[PDB]
Symmetry: C3
């Protein structure tokens, strides 16, 4: 497994394991959480991606059950968490909203640390761009969390370039990533300036839903799937390995986040690194994704 | 009333009074113009927003009738004017166009000064971005007007960030505002990079048509109006105060421009400053405005 | 004829002659190529615009037949060429794709030099923005070609501002142009930030298909054509001269590229420089092009 240094304080595995769906698994037992993590570690996948809101605010506690029952396991992994979304779940918020206040960020990180049973997270992301953001307040709160040692590095998620620029303008610490949807189903960022911006700044994006959240396999993408299967058969891997290799081929050093809860699929997650993806093949798949010839 | 320093040379009232419609009032008498201004001053609203083209090129002369008949009144107010649009009104322009030439800017400011009976305006805006702009010519003309003392400060109106960047690149003086449409009916700037750009540069926007030009009240925005009325009743103000408070809550320090010609509505214009607008309420109203949950 | 210095190493004619269609002329004889070039030179049009892919990879060899048979002719002209597109033409590429690799750029320039019978080109453009670009690799290859003397200057074509920014960030040499579609049929760049970006950087765009590739004359643009004909009759030139004068009027110093293969039309190509295009006329034509009044 390739590692990727996002800063002097943060190195991730090139492929990251996502826990959005950890609570969707009918088994949330400590042993089952440990089994998923151990299956990732066996392939050099060490980075786990979380958020405060995941699993109706239970997904970090479910991970915490695994970690708390396995001394030394947390020290083998990087934890990414997020804050900024407030989701209705009598004491529930009356409307889904964003909260990027220093107080909410601090409260979200303290709950994350208690739920996962650790004194630090590796990376904290602002989960969504906030139309009501006070960049000075949010920037100062993120810097203070890095200073405290509770957070090793900070970044953002779903930010447009102007959102990234505004928050970075109010901060000492460099924002080390933007976690954005990227896949053979979600290609707009390759042309619309969102990826160019990060590539120019030498910032690796993290790609969420790199298999479309399972939509790639739905039967709606028969031409893309036919090509992924043919390339997979040629190189002795599955269609998923080729779809992830498509992202890894980009010179912007995309960090894909896989979301499977299936231990058989976790076991082959690193096959993507075995794929040879030449420029012509990348454009074959891109052409199938955009449904027309390049201009 | 809060004041807002746009520069070392220009301080506005946080709420501005707009005179787009001053000529739509069947009464354009000096006494009636003075009554509107005095009703603004009574609430600490001191800034009046004008343009050369308003009232088929008569609105600044209508204001001038008020000022010329009331010695000392002009020295209690800030005057914002605009130039750059040439509107058909035999000697009329054959097509609506933009004119950002040094000669037209100078001619527009001299007519503004003669019509309003003053030797200076507080703020001059380029009224619309001009696809034919020569930024070097326009920039040099704006700088020269600041140097002359005829214009205390310069800004723009309806400019995209790239338009703002291009003209600022050709100027010594800082552009102190961008006057743009912002309201619960016109929310695109909060997400599309137009507001982020100004927030990053620490430039206050001026919001035009903050009640949609009256459209908010039309009966087409029943869900937004139901929420504004409920919040108004809770806090002892009208729906308009809450709609303006929604803009004032933003950390970018938006300066709303109200357009009513109704002396009863001018009298309560400052009620917006009495409203408590918490983050959850701001998102309640935003969610009603965009017609769906935030992402 | 006005000249335009793009750098200390590159001066073009203000109007450029394009050879996209040189192979569409049933006569590709050296004499006929020389006749087109001589007709351009007679009007001070010295810049010829080419690409590797033009004429199914034959257009530069067709020009080469003219040059190779006329000693001293190449030294009277500037040659613009392009690389980066790989077009299917058994050994053909299986999919249209982009190739901005150092190896492909070098191979494309060497074939261009052999086909045209010269040791240098005046300007090399990356033909299209490449979603798979490695800006560091492409930038270093472009810089190396300028250093070698094989290429006097480098620029891009069809790049968005973010594409231009990313490649320029990886290069020592300044990119001297962006060759983009601009015409009375293609006006988006005047408002969408693409032209503002280049105007702010003092980079002249080159306008391709300035007559819509002949579409202006199709009968679909009757209102625009009626106005161009009336202005042409007033000033003793044809509609084409007025349509090109419309581009030349812009303060961003647009360099139009004409594509006619008709020797009678080449002979009047410079009539565009005789047209007086005042601001009101520019907006008359712009208003016809966008199909509505300016805002
Ligand atoms: N920042 C954000 O806003 C944001 C938004 C979304 C997600 N994320 C992060 O990104 C991670 C990945 O996103 P994602 O969960 O959508 O991941 P994904 O890898 O795109 O999709 C995973 C889903 O696809 C299914 N799947 C995988 N392989 C399959 C196959 N061969 N056939 C059929 N179905 C298959 C999985 O089901 P099985 O479990 O049955 O294999 C699971 O439901 C999340 O876990 C989270 O960490 C962040
Ligand atoms: N830079 C630009 O391009 C630009 C464009 C537009 C305007 N502006 C500036 O912005 C200012 C404000 O814009 P605006 O005039 O559209 O202002 P606004 O405050 O959004 O709307 C004012 C209009 O709404 C009506 N109204 C107010 N309260 C109402 C209520 N409770 N019920 C029903 N109708 C109500 C007013 O009628 P009554 O008089 O009967 O109260 C008036 O017609 C202008 O005056 C001008 O200074 C600039
Ligand atoms: N960078 C890029 O991606 C890109 C894309 C397109 C083109 N280009 C460059 O731009 C150049 C110009 O583009 P273009 O060739 O589309 O040029 P253009 O000048 O817009 O159109 C030329 C076409 O219009 C026809 N035409 C000219 N005058 C006419 C008239 N009075 N009535 C009817 N038809 C008339 C010509 O036919 P006749 O020969 O019969 O006069 C020819 O087919 C190209 O040659 C190439 O160098 C670059
Ligand atoms: O340059 C002229 C045109 O040549 C080819 O048709 C290319 O595919 C196209 O992208 C280019 O714009
Ligand atoms: O991160 C996964 C997703 O979690 C929730 O569904 C959030 O509303 C959404 O904005 C986010 O993208
Ligand atoms: O400023 C108010 C409005 O006045 C005129 O209607 C102008 O055409 C318009 O562009 C402007 O926005």
């Amino acid at each position: 497994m390739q590692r990727i240094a996002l800063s002097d304080k943060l190195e991730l595995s090139r492929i990251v394991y996502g826990m959005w769906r950890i609570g969707d698994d009918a088994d949330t037992s400590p042993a089952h959480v440990q089994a998923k993590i151990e299956a990732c570690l066996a392939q050099g996948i060490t980075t786990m991606d979380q958020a405060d809101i995941y699993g109706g605010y239970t997904a970090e506690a479910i991970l915490g059950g695994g970690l708390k029952a396995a001394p030394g396991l947390r020290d083998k992994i990087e934890i990414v968490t997020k804050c900024g979304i407030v989701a209705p779940a009598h004491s529930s918020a009356r409307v889904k909203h964003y909260d990027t206040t220093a107080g909410h960020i601090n409260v979200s990180v303290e709950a994350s640390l208690r739920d996962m049973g650790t004194d630090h997270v590796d990376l904290l992301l602002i989960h969504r761009p906030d139309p009501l953001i006070d960049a000075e307040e949010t920037g100062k709160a993120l810097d203070a969390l890095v200073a405290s040692g509770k957070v090793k590095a900070v970044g953002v998620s779903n930010f447009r370039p102007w959102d990234f620029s505004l928050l970075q303008s109010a901060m000492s610490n460099r924002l080390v990533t933007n976690q954005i949807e990227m896949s053979l189903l979600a290609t707009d960022t390759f042309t619309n300036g969102d990826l160019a911006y990060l590539q120019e700044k030498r910032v690796s994006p993290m790609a969420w839903s790199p298999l479309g959240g399972g939509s790639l396999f739905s039967g709606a993408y028969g031409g893309t799937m036919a090509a992924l299967q043919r390339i997979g058969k040629e190189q002795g891997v599955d269609a998923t390995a080729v779809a992830i290799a498509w992202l890894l081929r980009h010179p912007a050093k995309i960090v894909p986040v896989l979301g499977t809860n299936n231990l058989e699929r976790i076991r082959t997650a690193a096959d993507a690194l075995r794929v040879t993806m030449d420029r012509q093949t990348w454009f074959e798949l891109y052409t199938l994704a955009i449904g027309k010839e390049v201009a």
